[PDB]
């Protein structure tokens, strides 16, 4: 067979969902590209990981003229 | 892989060195960068040397 | 010229509609104007026969619901996928 | 400029009362002149584009821009970014002086000259013309011509239609057959 190859699964996806209480540094989503964009109190890493920059609750929301999904942290 | 390993040697006399790679066929001129020398704790000129 | 006898539906949904069709009746809806839509049941065979004729789909019809005459026009029909049966009809108030 | 004076004095009034214009800026203007040289023979010798560019500088009086192949094209042995032409954009005093030079020295110097077409309008009031040879210009010397290079000349205008474009270019007595 010419086939028979694959790669290891990368375990991407949302790690903390809406309303979850996280500590600063906690990874919220792992992704390829900015499928989600960083909102308030959230940073975007070199591999587009979104992580909490403050303690608080995860909040998903859609905004902007392109209807894009932003992830923010609402402080406690 | 044709890029070869080189070292960047401190000009401060400390002996501290960085390492990198370099396409010697296309870029024969010696690499020279200003980099942090942690022994003297200053940014100084570093110069290419053999690995 | 087409008069249709109808009854206001007691229950809605998939199970209710399928039970209606298992008993030789089928659901229909009347909408249009400012009044709320009216969900009705029709006897399948009589309406099937009526709509065999193409004047059913272009003239004003009259549905009698508890004696009240409502003038409508057929707006859409849902047909059974392969049997000569009717599944649902939309009637717009005219 | 000298022909901008002519425009501002005569051409605006004549075109206003010919076209029932509301405002003076509804009248077509001559906004820019572009001169280029397809010198794809540079592929062979870069020196060519250099000589074509110097010819263009002599003709126009401002240094040209070296234009590059937008893509790689297999039909001419050109890669993306290989220089195959020159261009000068003239606006203001220089474009008006060039307009007068071209109209009153250059076009009389074209072999078998029998008028320029009036169908050469792009469709939106812009006129383009070619120059088989460069000597038609007195700014290029003859006893030194290294090669015979022509050029293209385009006159962009604010004229919305070809009719308004011809009308404006005619007000200057542009030799239309």
């Amino acid at each position: 067979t010419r086939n028979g190859r694959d790669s290891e699964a990368k375990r991407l996806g949302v790690k903390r969902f809406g309303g979850e209480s996280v500590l600063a540094g906690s990874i919220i989503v792992r992704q390829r590209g900015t499928k989600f964009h960083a909102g308030a109190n959230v940073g975007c890493g070199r591999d587009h990981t979104l992580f909490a920059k403050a303690d608080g609750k995860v909040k998903f929301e859609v905004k902007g003229p392109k209807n894009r999904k932003f992830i923010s942290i609402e402080a406690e | 892989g044709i890029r070869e390993k080189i070292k960047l040697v401190s000009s401060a006399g400390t002996g501290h060195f960085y390492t990198t790679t370099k396409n010697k066929r296309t870029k024969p001129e010696k690499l020279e960068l200003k980099k942090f020398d942690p022994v003297v704790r200053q940014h100084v000129i570093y110069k290419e040397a053999k690995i | 010229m087409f008069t249709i006898n109808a009854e206001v539906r007691k229950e809605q949904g998939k199970g209710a509609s399928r039970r209606l069709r298992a008993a030789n009746k089928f659901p229909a809806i009347i909408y249009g104007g400012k009044e709320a839509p009216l969900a009705i049941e029709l006897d399948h065979d009589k309406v099937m026969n009526m709509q065999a004729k193409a004047e059913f789909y272009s003239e004003v019809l009259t549905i009698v619901v508890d004696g009240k005459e409502i003038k409508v026009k057929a707006q859409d029909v849902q047909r059974h996928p392969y049997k000569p049966k009717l599944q649902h009809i939309d009637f717009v108030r005219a | 400029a000298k022909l901008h004076d002519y425009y501002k004095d005569e051409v605006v009034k004549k075109l206003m009362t010919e076209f029932n214009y509301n405002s003076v800026m509804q009248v077509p203007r001559v906004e820019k002149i572009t001169l280029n040289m397809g010198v794809g023979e540079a592929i062979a010798d870069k020196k060519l584009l250099d000589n074509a560019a110097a010819d263009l500088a002599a003709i126009s009086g401002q240094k040209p821009l070296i234009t590059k192949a937008r893509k790689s094209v297999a039909g001419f042995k050109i890669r993306q970014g290989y220089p195959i032409g020159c261009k000068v954009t003239l606006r203001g005093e220089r474009m008006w002086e060039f307009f007068e030079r071209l109209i009153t020295i250059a076009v009389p110097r074209i072999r078998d000259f029998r008028g320029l077409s009036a169908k050469s309008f792009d469709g939106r009031g812009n006129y383009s013309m070619g120059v088989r040879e460069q000597i038609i210009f007195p700014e290029i010397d003859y006893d030194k011509v290294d090669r015979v290079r022509g050029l293209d000349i385009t006159i962009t205008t604010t004229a919305k239609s070809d009719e308004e474009g011809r009308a404006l270019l005619a007000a200057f007595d542009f030799p239309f057959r």
Binding site: - | - | - | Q62, E100, I105, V107, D141, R177
Partner: protein, 60 residues
């Protein structure tokens, strides 16, 4: 315009054959002497048959 990159663009003189003189800026350096100008060319001023051909040699 930029500095020192442009051709020396000085006002020159240009005299036609029909007596037309135009004071022109161009990048030639010397003055201009030209045979035909816009005001003495055939097309600008509007200066640009077999029965006759047969009958020119055919006085009956």
């Amino acid at each position: 315009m930029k500095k020192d990159i442009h051709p020396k663009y000085e006002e020159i003189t240009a005299s036609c054959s029909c007596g037309n003189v135009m004071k022109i800026r161009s990048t030639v350096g010397h003055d201009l002497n030209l045979d035909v100008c816009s005001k003495c060319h055939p097309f600008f001023t509007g200066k640009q048959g077999r029965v006759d051909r047969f009958n020119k040699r055919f006085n009956i």
